[PDB]
Amino acid sequence: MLRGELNNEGVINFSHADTYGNDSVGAHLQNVVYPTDAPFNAATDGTTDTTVAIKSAIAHCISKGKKLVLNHLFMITDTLVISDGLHVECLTSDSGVKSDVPAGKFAVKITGANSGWFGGKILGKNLPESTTVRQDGVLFDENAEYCFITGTEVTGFFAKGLHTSDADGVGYGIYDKGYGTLISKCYANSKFCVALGGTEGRVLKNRITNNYLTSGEAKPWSWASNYWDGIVSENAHRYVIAFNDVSACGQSGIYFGGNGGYSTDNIIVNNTVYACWNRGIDMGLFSEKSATNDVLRNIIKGNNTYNNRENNIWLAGVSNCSVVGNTSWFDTNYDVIFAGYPGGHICISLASGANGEACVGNTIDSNTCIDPRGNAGITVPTGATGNVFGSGNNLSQAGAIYIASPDLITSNRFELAVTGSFTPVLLPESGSITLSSSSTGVFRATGNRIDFSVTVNVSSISSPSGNLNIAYLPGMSGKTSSTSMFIIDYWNDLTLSSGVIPLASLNLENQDQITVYRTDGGRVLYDFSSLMKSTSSFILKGFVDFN
Amino acid sequence: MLRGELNNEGVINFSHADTYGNDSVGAHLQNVVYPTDAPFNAATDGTTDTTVAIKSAIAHCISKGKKLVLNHLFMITDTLVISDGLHVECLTSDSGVKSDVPAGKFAVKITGANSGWFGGKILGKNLPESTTVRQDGVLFDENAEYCFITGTEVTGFFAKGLHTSDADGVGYGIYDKGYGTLISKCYANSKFCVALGGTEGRVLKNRITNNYLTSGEAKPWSWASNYWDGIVSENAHRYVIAFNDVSACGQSGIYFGGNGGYSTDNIIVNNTVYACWNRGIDMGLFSEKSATNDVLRNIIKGNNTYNNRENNIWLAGVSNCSVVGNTSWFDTNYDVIFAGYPGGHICISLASGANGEACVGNTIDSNTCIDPRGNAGITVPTGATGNVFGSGNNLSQAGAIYIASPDLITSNRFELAVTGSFTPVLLPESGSITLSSSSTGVFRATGNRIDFSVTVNVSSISSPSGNLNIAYLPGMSGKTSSTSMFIIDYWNDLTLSSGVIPLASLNLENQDQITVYRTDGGRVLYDFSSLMKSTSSFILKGFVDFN
Amino acid sequence: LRGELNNEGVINFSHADTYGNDSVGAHLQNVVYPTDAPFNAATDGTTDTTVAIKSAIAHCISKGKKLVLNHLFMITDTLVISDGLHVECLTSDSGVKSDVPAGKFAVKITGANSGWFGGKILGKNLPESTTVRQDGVLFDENAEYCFITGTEVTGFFAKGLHTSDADGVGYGIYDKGYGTLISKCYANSKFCVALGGTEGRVLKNRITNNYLTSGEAKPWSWASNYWDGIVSENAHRYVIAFNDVSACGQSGIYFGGNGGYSTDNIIVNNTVYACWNRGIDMGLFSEKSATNDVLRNIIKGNNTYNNRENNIWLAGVSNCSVVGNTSWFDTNYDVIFAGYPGGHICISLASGANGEACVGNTIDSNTCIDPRGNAGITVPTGATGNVFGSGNNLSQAGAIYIASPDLITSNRFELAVTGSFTPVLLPESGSITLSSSSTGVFRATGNRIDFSVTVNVSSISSPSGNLNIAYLPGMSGKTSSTSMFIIDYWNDLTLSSGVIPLASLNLENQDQITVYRTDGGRVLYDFSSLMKSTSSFILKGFVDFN
Ligand SMILES: C[C@@H]1O[C@@H](O)[C@H](O)[C@H](O)[C@H]1O[C@@H]1O[C@H](CO[C@H]2O[C@H](CO)[C@H](O)[C@H](O[C@@H]3O[C@@H](C)[C@H](O[C@@H]4O[C@H](CO[C@H]5O[C@H](CO)[C@H](O)[C@H](O)[C@H]5O)[C@@H](O)[C@H](O)[C@@H]4O)[C@@H](O)[C@H]3O)[C@H]2O)[C@@H](O)[C@H](O)[C@@H]1O
Ligand SMILES: C[C@@H]1O[C@@H](O)[C@H](O)[C@H](O)[C@H]1O[C@@H]1O[C@H](CO[C@H]2O[C@H](CO)[C@H](O)[C@H](O[C@@H]3O[C@@H](C)[C@H](O[C@@H]4O[C@H](CO[C@H]5O[C@H](CO)[C@H](O)[C@H](O)[C@H]5O)[C@@H](O)[C@H](O)[C@@H]4O)[C@@H](O)[C@H]3O)[C@H]2O)[C@@H](O)[C@H](O)[C@@H]1O
C-alpha cells in the first residue's frame, strides 16, 4: 500500500544501495552522496574512525557516477584514493578529513583523469615538536592527469629529521607528480608545503608558509628542522606558479633543483615572496650537472621578493633562465626577523653550482633592486658566460652590479655598465720601460664596447727601442674587435721633432694591447720606444667594440 | 505508525530546526539550506523584506555547519554578516540580495577566516541622480582572512556628494580591508566600484565600470559627482590586480595613493584600462609624503591602457615603482568621448606630487607608446632622480621623451636617448673672448655617456691669454667622469706654427669644462687663449662617461 | 496522508507541480535533473534526449532553477543556454554527446551570465571521415559575460574547408561574444578554439588537436582536419594566459589578418610547442585595410619551442610587443619534423602577404636558444619603427639578422648589428680607384653607428681638390646630431712635415666623410691631390644619427 510505495521510492529507508525509478524522490536524492547516508553511515563526532564508510562512499560514487560531498570533518587512519575522475566536494570550509594516517602513506591520493578535491580541510596531527610523528598530506601520483585541488586548507603534516626514502614519511603538504595538476586558492603549511615533480601544473593564488618565524623552533636552522621550503621542485616541467603569497618559510619560498631533478620550462610570475629563512626564489644545482640533473629555461617575472635571509633571487649553475621585471628589496625589518643570523642580503645573485657549474645564457633585465645597505643589487661570479645584464635594471637604490672578475666583461654582455681599473705596463720591442705607480688604467664596459683611459708615467728605462705597446686591456685577451678608436691627448717629455705627434691604435695581433707610434710626413713610424725617457708621460683615451 | 515516522524523519513538516537520524531523508536535505525552508520561510515575491529570515538561515548554517544557498533575489534592509567560514552560494545568476539598507551600513559584510560569497547579485538602489540616497555594497572587514567574492554582480551603490566619514554612506561597490581577499569574475559598478585598504588581495578577472560616459551627469566633472574611480586604493599592500577590464570611469581606472594612504608592493598586470575621465593607471601623492602616506614599489606590467583623458599611466611623487612592457595609446576616439574637455593626452607621465615630492627610483622600460598627435610618449619633470628610462621603450609612433630640464640627464639614467642644445662660451685664463650667435652646442645623452659637438666662432676679443676652457657642458655641473675623449677636427684663423695641432681634454677640476690646448713637439702647451683672433673658429667633438 | 504526500511532492514528484515552501517537494525543485519528471530523460547514453533536455532548460529558465546534467546525454539538435542559465555537470563524465548535424553547434551559449561547468561536450570524433562535419560550442554575438569552465570539448572535425559556416566548420569552442570566460577546459577539434569577440579571457586551458600522432598523411594541406590551437579574427581585448598549447596541425595561437581586425590582445605565460606551423602567429594574409589588420598585441612571458615554421612570427603587423619570452629549439625538432623542415627561427618579422611592413613593434628581453646557430631574431627589408632592445639574449643562438643595411637607421637596434661595405673615394676632380683589399665595417648600436674604413689605393687618374669617403651604410638621406672621426694610420701620401689628415662628416651628404688636412692655423680641402697609386689610410669613428 502506502508504506510499501514509500520504500519503493526511497522516501523511507533511503539508501544509496537501493534502486529507485527515476521519477522517485529516492532517485533524485541519489545524485548527491553524503558519507553519513546509508549504507555508509559515517560518524559525525570527528573522533571515531570513518575510513571504511568514506572508502565505500568513494567507491560507490565512482561505480554509479555520482557526486561525493563530505559534510563533516571526518577522522581517517588510511589513505583515501580519489580516482576515476571522482570529485570530492566539501560541504563547507570546515568539512574534509583529519588524518591519523601512519608514516609512509598519504592522507589523500588523487590519480586518474580529471579527479580532484574542492574546499574544506585535509589536516594532519600538527605536532612539529614530536620526534616520532611523520605524515604526508596530499599526493597527485604519476597517473594523475588534469587532476586538481582547489580551495582547501592542507595543514599540519610534519616529520622531524630528514627521511631516507618516501616510506619514512616526508612531511609533504601537497606533492604533485601528475600531469596538468591545478593547485589553486589553497592554504598549504607543512614541512614542505608544496612539492612539484610533475609536468604542466598550475599553482595559482595559493597561500604558502610554514611560519618558521613564529614557530618557536630553536635556531639556528639545520637539516633536523621541521620547517623547509614553501615550494620545493625537482623534475618539475612547464609549471606556471602565479599569484601566490609565499612567506616565512623555514628554507626557500620557491625552489627548483638541481638536486636529483631535471627542472625546465617553468614560469614563476606575479608572486609575492618574503621573510624566508633561506632564499626567496631559489634556482640551484646542488647535485652535479647531468642529463638528469639541471635547471633550465625558467622565467622569473613580475614578482615582488623581499627580506629573504640569504638572497631574494638566487641562481646557481643554472642556464637559460630569465629574471625580468621583478622588484627585489630589503628594509630594516630584515635586521629584526633575522637578528642573530645574518645572511647575504642580496637582491639578485648569480653563483656557481655546488660542483662549480657556471651560470650560462641567463637574462637579467628590467628589475628594480632596492638595498639600503648598499649591497650590490646584482652579483656575478667568475666562470659565468653568455649572460645578458640589461640596462633597464635599476640599481640606483642599491649598490651597482658587482662582478667577481674583470674577464666577465667580454664573456657576458653588460649593458648595465661595469667599471674597474688596471695597472698598465709598457712593452718595447727591446729593452724595458718601467712605469711609476702613479700610472693608472680605467675601463667601463657598456654592452660590447669598452672605454679606456690610460695615464702612463715612466719611472725608469733601460735601453728601450723599437715598437711600443701598452698592456694589458681588461677583458680583451683572446678577443677580437670590429672597430676601435684611440687618441693620445696629452704627453710630456718625449723626444719628438716639431710637427711630429703621437698616434695610437689597437694591436691587431694581440687586441689587449694598444700600439703607440708617431707621424713622419706621408707615413708613420713604429719607433716610439726610442723616443721615451725615464721622465716621459702620456695619456691615452678611447674605446674598443669587441666581438 | 506511518504518519509518526515520516514526521520523525523530516519527510513531512520538514524543518532545519528539527533533529533527524542520519539515515533519514530529512538528514540528507538538511545539508543544504534555503531561506525559503522552515523555519526561515523567506518571502519569494522579491518585494517583501527578508532580512530576518535570511539572518536566521545564516546563523543556523554557522551553528550547524551546513551550506547556505540563496534561491531567489531577496530584499534586505540591514547588513547581512557572513562570518565563521560561511559561504553564501547563489543558486543562479538571478539569486542574491537587493539592498535598501540605509546610509552608514553595507548590504553584506564579510569577515572571519575563509568566509565568502559565490555568484548571483548584490544590488543597490541605483539612483545616481538622487541627492538623498547613499549606500555601500560589500565590505570585507579588518578581521576578514582569505575571504572571497567570486562571480557576483555588485552594482548600483551610490552617494551624491562627498562623505565626511564612513558613517555618511560612501558609495562603495566592494570595499576590502581584509587579508588575502579574492575578488574574481565579478561585475562591479558603483560610485567607487572597488576600494582596496587591505593586504595580499587578489583582484582577478573582473569587469569594472561606473559608466560615466553614458551617465547623463552634467559636466564638467567635479567633487560632487557620483562617478569616481574603478579601483581606488589607500593603505593597499601586496595586491595583485590582473586580467581586469576597466573602463569608462568617472575618475581613474586603477588608482593608488597617497591621499591618506600608505600603498606598497602591489602588482598591476595584464589589465585593459580605457576611456576613464581622469587617468588609466594612476599612482600619486595628493597629500604630503610621510611614513603613513606614500606609494612605493608597485609594479605596472603588461597592461593595455588607452584613451584616458588625463593620461594613460601617471606617476606622481611615487618611489621605486615600475612600468614595464605596457602598451599605452591614443586614437581619434579620444576627442569624441572627451569633446570639450581636453586633458594631458600623455601615454606615460611622471610628475611631482601635489606638495612637490620627487619621483625617485622608478623604472620605465619596454613600453610601447602610440600618440598620433606627436605628444611625448614619456614626460619627466624637474626634481626626478634615480629613475631609469630604458632603451627597450618604443616611442617611434609618438613624440620623443620630454624632459623638463637638462640637469635630469645626470640625475637619472636615460638609455632612451635625450638630445638638446646649449650656447657655448669661452673662458680664457685672462681677458675675454666673445662668441658669435652662430656658435652652437649639442648634446645627446645615452645612459651614463654624453656625446657633444660644439662650434666655436669668435666674434671679438679683449686681451685674451693663457689657458682656455669651453663651457658649460649640460648636466655635468658637480659631476665626475671615469673616461672621456675629445678632438678638434676643424679650425680656422688661429696663430699656430707648422705642425702644431689643437688638443682638447676634459677639465678634471670642473668637469663641465673642456680644456683646449696644443702641441709643442715633445710636450704640449696651455696657452691657447693667446693664439686666438677675433675671427678664429674651431669645432670640437667628444663624449664623457659620467659617474 | 497520501493526498498530503502528493500535495507536498513526496509522491509523484515533478518539477511541473506546485508545492509550498515548507514542503520537501519545494526543497527539491531548486535543483533540476533531466531524468526527474516531467522530463524523464533516458540514461542509456544512446537514446536521443534532446526534447527532454531542452524542456528542462526552458523550465529552469522559466522558474529560476539550477540545472544539473547527471549522465552523458545524446543529443541531435542544438541545446541553447540563454537568460543566465548555468548548466552544471554532476560529474566529469556527465555532459552531452553530439550527433547534431552539420551547420549547427552542439551547445550554444548566449544572453548575459549564461554558462557551462564541467563534464564533456563530445562530437563524433571521426577526423578521417570525408562526410561528417560538426561544431562544438558557440558563444554568439549576444553572449555577455558568459563562460565555459571545467569542460572537455572534443571530437569536432570537418574534413575539407567550408565555404560558409552553414557547411560545418570543425570548431571546438567558438567565441563571438563579449567578455567570454573559457577556462580549465580541454579543447581538441579541427580548430580547437576560435576567437572573434571582444574582452574574452582564455585561461589555463589544455589545447591541442594532436596532429603529430594523428596518422593523417603529410604533407599538410588545406584538406587537413587539423588546424590551429587558437584561431583569432576580429579579436579584441582578449587575455590568453596559462594555456598548454601543443602539437597542433597549424599554429598554437594565431591572430589575423585574414578577414579580421584584431587588436589589443594580451598573450602571456602560455606554453606553446610542437605545432606544425608557428607557435604564436600574428600576420596579415589578406591585404591591410581598416577592417583587416593586426595591431597592439602584447606577447609576453611565454615559453615557445620546437614549432616547425618559427616559434614567434609577426608578418606585416604594427604596434605589437614581444617581451620576456623564452624561445628555443632542440634536437627533438629534427625528430618530430623529419622530412618536413621549416624555418626554425625563434623570433621572426616578415612582411605581410601583400608586402605590408612590420611597423612600430617592440622586441625586448627575450631569451632565444638555437643550437643550429640560426639568427635568434630576423628582420625583413621594409620594416620601420621597430625597436630591438639590448635586453634580448641571443648568445645561445645566432645573432640578429637584417635583410638590408638600410634597416639600421629606419629602426632602432639597441641589440647591435654589425656589417660591412666596400668603400669608394670621391675626389673633387678626376678619379681614385681602390684595391679590393679595402674594407668598410659598421656596427649600429641604438642611434649610433661605429665605422672602421681601410682605404688602399690601386690606381689614380689625375685627382685633385676635395676628397670624400663613401658610402656609409644606412646614412643616405639622414642627418646627425654628432660625429667623431680620426685617421690613425697612413702610408705613401704627399704630406709635408707637420701636416696630418683630418676627417669629418660631410654635412651636405651625410653618408660621406670629408678627408682633408692641416696647414698651420687653418685646414685645407686639397687631399685628393695628395694621393698616389699606392696610398693607404685607415679611418675610424662614429655617427650619432637623427
Ligand atoms: C655585497 C657587497 O656589496 C657592495 O658593497 C660591493 O659590490 C661589494 O663588493 C660586495 O661584496 C662582494 O659580494 C660577493 C658576495 O655576494 C654575496 O652574494 C653571494 C652570491 O652571489 C652570496 O650570497 C654571498 O653570501 C655568502 O656566500 C653564500 C654561499 C653563503 O650562503 C650559503 O649558501 C649555501 C649554498 O646553497 C644554496 O645553493 C644551492 C645550489 O648550489 C641551492 O640552490 C640551495 O637551495 C641554496 O640555498 C647554503 O647551503 C648555505 O647554508 C649558505 O646559505 C652565505 O651565507 C654567505 O656566506 C653574499 O654576501 C663576494 O663574492 C665578494 O667577495 C664581495 O664580498
Ligand atoms: C606633451 C608635448 O609633446 C611634444 O609636443 C613636445 O615634447 C612638447 O614639449 C610637449 O609639451 C610639454 O610637456 C609637458 C606637458 O605635460 C603633460 O604631462 C604632465 C605630467 O608630466 C601633465 O599631465 C600635463 O597636464 C597638465 O598638468 C596636470 C597636472 C593637470 O592635471 C591636473 O592634475 C591634478 C592632480 O591630480 C592627479 O595627481 C594626484 C597626485 O598629485 C593623484 O594621483 C590624482 O589621482 C591625479 O588625478 C588634478 O587634481 C586636476 O584635476 C588635473 O587633472 C592637467 O589638467 C594639465 O593641466 C600634460 O600636459 C609640459 O610640462 C611642457 O610645458 C610642455 O607642455
Ligand SMILES: C[C@@H]1O[C@@H](O)[C@H](O)[C@H](O)[C@H]1O[C@@H]1O[C@H](CO[C@H]2O[C@H](CO)[C@H](O)[C@H](O[C@@H]3O[C@@H](C)[C@H](O[C@@H]4O[C@H](CO[C@H]5O[C@H](CO)[C@H](O)[C@H](O)[C@H]5O)[C@@H](O)[C@H](O)[C@@H]4O)[C@@H](O)[C@H]3O)[C@H]2O)[C@@H](O)[C@H](O)[C@@H]1O
Ligand atoms: C637563418 C640563418 O641564421 C644565421 O645563420 C644567419 O643570420 C643567416 O643569415 C640566416 O639566414 C637568413 O634567414 C632569413 C630569414 O629566414 C627564415 O625566417 C623567415 C622569417 O623571417 C622565414 O620563416 C623563412 O622561411 C621562408 O619564408 C616564409 C615566408 C615561408 O613560410 C611560408 O609562410 C606562408 C604565409 O603564412 C604565414 O604568414 C601569414 C601572414 O601573411 C599568416 O601569419 C600565417 O598564419 C603564417 O603561417 C605560408 O602560407 C606558407 O605555407 C609557408 O609556411 C617558409 O616556407 C620559408 O620559405 C626562414 O627560413 C632569410 O630571409 C635570409 O634569406 C637568410 O637565409
